[PDB]
Ligand binder design. Structure first.
Ligand SMILES: *[C@@H]1O[C@H](CO)[C@@H](O)[C@H](O)[C@H]1NC(C)=O
Ligand SMILES: *[C@@H]1O[C@H](CO)[C@@H](O)[C@H](O)[C@H]1NC(C)=O
Ligand SMILES: [Mn+2]
Ligand SMILES: [Mn+2]
Lengths: 587, 583
């Protein structure tokens, strides 16, 4: 029928989070039933996958999280060759942690790929008989034939089918615990973690197992017949399946399936709401719809480790990019030694291309303090403020430096900003520190190593003020004339369309998502800063340089619609704040 | 069983060719039986689809072509408001054109998508009874029920999906039957609005016993009856069906090369030679992947977009030839602004990227205004950028006697096209083996004012904003084309006769690909002539993913491929080759 199929997965860390996304893409493509994922996760996986599934909005898919750390005390007495083995052991205790009403589940490891509809494997449960409660595929390796005890060749636990009711009725907890203790007296440690334990139980209790055909867990023989693949001539085809699912557009999987009632979690309810309230006749409909659009988000795509800073002064460089600016990553890493947060607007293919590039970069693999957040492409305009908000929400520091992927910061800018947060008393007062922005017209080989070199180059016409030839306003309030000779930080007041690059405390106002596509977004943000009486201080020894780039993908209606978005922003601001808004409209 | 299912499709033109590839993807994803396609095609479709199925190498799939142009006289007497309707009319004559041994077929239109195994529809033939020979789904529009009309029975029927019992149709003298009906109706109605469909309906009006009505769900006309829907007919609830269409558009066609699990096929001979060549290789060699990719066959889709070439009066027309990946799509409009003559492009894409490119072109006025650009899709496969396969695909399929072998990242000078034509006449390229060199420069400025004369070019060089990409002084001041000799690692951009030697397919990835090509031109005694007034400029761009590929072993293997080229050259030619080794 439309019965819901229940899938339990243990997943800890960043790699497992990626891998489970790939598994889930595989199940969804061929699925025809509702799905309920029970993710037993550590804190890292729980955060990443929680946000991921919230923003994915897959119809008819429920996801429950179970804290895996709170489970280690159940299996930590069983020694393992690899510490990660403890997570494997946790399958043994699913009967305890899963809800009591849940009668049967399919357990999968993260390196499993589906090649068919999961309803078939789920249907195999009906062929169980009597005291059969475990469904497993023979271990296709000769590990147990030549080592913990096993029944014949033994069984692989990458794919397990559990009758939870019967397992609870048989008091499975006591049984596997006794078996484990009894065998652990002789064998000192488990090599293959849960797998070992399971085989011993099935060896001791050969009535428990129902052997699944080889083809429900193809451990990489028996291409039509192969249905579930397990990684560790026909290999090239399956590697192409795996690559096909890595790169397959997750957004295509939001497809609804009738016959079955769908569930719109809570975010989908409100999205449907907002898209209904809209005026379809209005010619800026795409702008309003992308004001409310929800993108798949995969936080912390790569391994991440932040080292707690002594001071409460640490600063994160925050930026966003699409694939055409991948070239900037390493450059920034050479110039900025502190933590970095990046929102990357990619397609799934581009996400995996980025994966390969980053793993093949010495600088990127040596940096563990850069969080790379993937916002998957959707719709027609570059959601610059969505991206900025995603990057700036997920930082590990009290202060952040809001930059572009296209600037290279001054060498030593990071430590200088920390000294500045101390010097300008950013801990006790509401201030926005400005980093003066300059530009170059072609890539250069010697980067200025001092403000004196900066000034010499500027006097030769090889460096210029940022956007100097198009919008001299926007950075003119910085006053580069007095910055030139200044030695003390100095205060500047707000002017129309002013758009500096600032370092601020992390809980500052976010960007307004109504301004999709290229427009007056940063200007609106700076106005938001100025109403809340953020003080604009220019730093006498800081600077950043914009690298030249080709334009990225100008209809008259688009100009008109931006103008209407600007108007509606000023009107929501007049209502939002009050008399304070007036000094900005006269601009 | 392993019984073969026969599918006949009428396809003319470029749009139809893309659409039929989509149809075939959807059939292959669900098929479990061998397949035999009967493609009734105009010349364009025959060229396109012949190459596509040759390179696709789908197991257990046979493809026969029937020249549709030689069939026009069968139906041209039936006037239509659309000339394209003529190809529709050709369904009426399948009993004549399909082979005599062929008992039954499924006829499909190009805009059909399958959602299930085609053997189910094929089995529906067994429910036919008595004098029934035509299987059709009711027409879901109200076209025949009112003024929005040819005679029809009730709703009428949709002709996008038809089941034909060819034996009984031949015994019934079906040709005279529908012809009689067409003429009788044609005396009253002056022309057909919907072509073959009308005539079919007229027959069913006159002969209501012929039809077996298929359920609506074998031909869902979209312009309700979701699990039960099996075949979709294209023309809120839309998003589900467009997502199926997107899912088949984006599916990796190469995955459909999987073997038929129950039935042994023979994969013609293109797989026979691929298998031979991949067996003869030495797997112990550390450049095995390069050698394996020397012979890989990539799925190829020539003329992915509408193409229309205007025959040149004189025999001097030149084609700009180039290759690109998705990351350089931005360049197309620029090249079209600089080169008004014909263009042939090899695009190394995935299926998703191919459909994204379709969208991009559909939204570009400069690209839609140009009908003289051929877009050839070489679908990605393997590990290295098959640059010379790409160049060869692009340069073989041109419409002109001469070709300009360029790179996607240069913009040619304005008016280069006419200059090259005038040059082929003055340098007598019709009677002699010559390679005209187009001097290539480069800029590091991203906001460049493109020089509109050689004098402006030279000033920009004198101010340091342009630089070379020989005696530049001889070119600087030259006014006559001049001859230059070959030198080590020589690599100019040349305009040559269309039958010059092709690129050597062993050079996968970036290395001595062009060096070897130019070296071939020099052994076959082409003259290198520099044009004094031609030039093209390299525009700065973000790097591609070549930047990732270029492992130590990859450097070693590229140098090894150069060595092996020189060695095969010494064997093929002789002492004339030695002067290139001494370099
Ligand atoms: C996770 O993958 C990264 C590279 O993608 C690797 O450096 C790291 O060691 C992996 N973590 C493991 C194997 O625990
Ligand atoms: C072919 O399809 C394209 C869509 O890309 C359309 O713009 C064009 O008008 C079509 N031409 C014909 C003759 O159907
Ligand atoms: Mn910029
Ligand atoms: Mn280039």
């Amino acid at each position: 029928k439309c019965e819901t199929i229940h899938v339990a997965i243990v997943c800890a860390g960043y790699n497992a989070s990626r891998d489970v996304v790939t598994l889930v893409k595989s199940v969804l493509f061929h699925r025809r039933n509702p799905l309920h994922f029970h993710l037993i996760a550590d804190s890292i996986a729980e955060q990443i996958l929680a946000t991921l599934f919230q923003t994915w909005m897959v119809p008819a898919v429920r996801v429950d999280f179970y804290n895996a750390d709170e489970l280690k005390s159940e299996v930590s007495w069983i020694p393992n060759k690899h510490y990660s083995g403890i997570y494997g052991l946790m399958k043994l205790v699913l009967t305890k942690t899963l809800p009591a009403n849940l009668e049967r589940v399919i357990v999968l490891d993260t390196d499993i790929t589906f090649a068919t509809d999961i309803a078939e494997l789920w249907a195999v449960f009906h062929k169980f008989k009597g005291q059969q409660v475990l469904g497993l595929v023979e271990n296709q390796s000769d590990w147990y034939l030549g080592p913990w005890p096993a029944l014949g060749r033994g069984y692989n636990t990458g794919v397990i089918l559990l009758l939870l009711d019967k397992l609870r009725k048989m008091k499975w907890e006591q049984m596997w615990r006794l078996t484990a203790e009894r065998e652990l007296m002789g064998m000192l440690s488990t090599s293959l973690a849960d797998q070992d334990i399971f085989n011993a139980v099935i060896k001791q209790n050969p009535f428990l197992v129902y052997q699944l055909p080889c083809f429900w867990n193809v451990q990489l023989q028996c291409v039509s017949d192969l249905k579930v693949i397990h990684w560790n001539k026909h290999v090239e085809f399956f590697r192409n399946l795996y690559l096909t699912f890595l790169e397959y557009d997750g957004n295509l999987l939001r497809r609804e399936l009738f016959g079955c009632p769908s569930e719109a979690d809570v975010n989908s309810e409100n999205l449907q709401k907002q898209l209904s309230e809209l005026d379809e006749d209005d010619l800026c409909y795409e702008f309003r719809r992308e004001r409310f659009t929800v993108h798949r988000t995969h936080l912390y795509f790569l391994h991440y480790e932040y080292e707690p800073a002594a001071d409460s002064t640490d600063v994160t460089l925050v930026a966003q990019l699409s694939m055409d600016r991948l070239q900037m990553l390493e450059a920034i890493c050479k110039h900025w030694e502190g933590p970095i947060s990046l929102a990357l607007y990619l397609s799934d293919a581009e996400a995996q291309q980025f994966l390969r590039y980053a793993q093949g970069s010495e600088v990127l693999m040596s940096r563990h303090n850069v969080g790379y957040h993937i916002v998957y492409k959707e719709g027609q305009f570059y959601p610059v403020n969505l991206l900025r908000n995603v990057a700036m929400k997920h930082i590990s520091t009290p202060y952040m430096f809001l930059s572009d992927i296209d600037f290279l910061p001054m060498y030593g800018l990071y430590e200088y900003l920390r000294k500045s947060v101390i010097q300008l008393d950013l801990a006790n007062t509401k201030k926005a520190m400005i980093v003066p922005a300059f530009e170059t017209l072609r890539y250069r080989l010697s980067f200025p190593k001092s403000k004196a070199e900066l000034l010499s180059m500027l006097d030769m016409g090889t460096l210029f003020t940022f956007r100097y030839h198009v919008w001299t306003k926007g950075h003119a309030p910085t006053n580069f004339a007095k910055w030139r000779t200044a030695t003390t930080p100095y205060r500047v007041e707000w002017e129309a369309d002013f758009e500096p690059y600032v370092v601020v405390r992390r809980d500052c106002p976010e960007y307004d998502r109504r301004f999709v596509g290229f427009g007056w977004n940063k200007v609106a943000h700076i106005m938001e800063l100025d109403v809340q009486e953020y003080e604009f201080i220019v730093l006498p020894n800081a600077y950043m340089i914009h690298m030249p780039h080709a334009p990225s993908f100008s209809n008259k209606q688009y100009r008109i619609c931006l103008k209407t978005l600007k108007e509606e922003f000023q009107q929501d601001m007049s209502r939002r704040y009050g008399f304070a808004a007036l000094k900005y409209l006269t601009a």
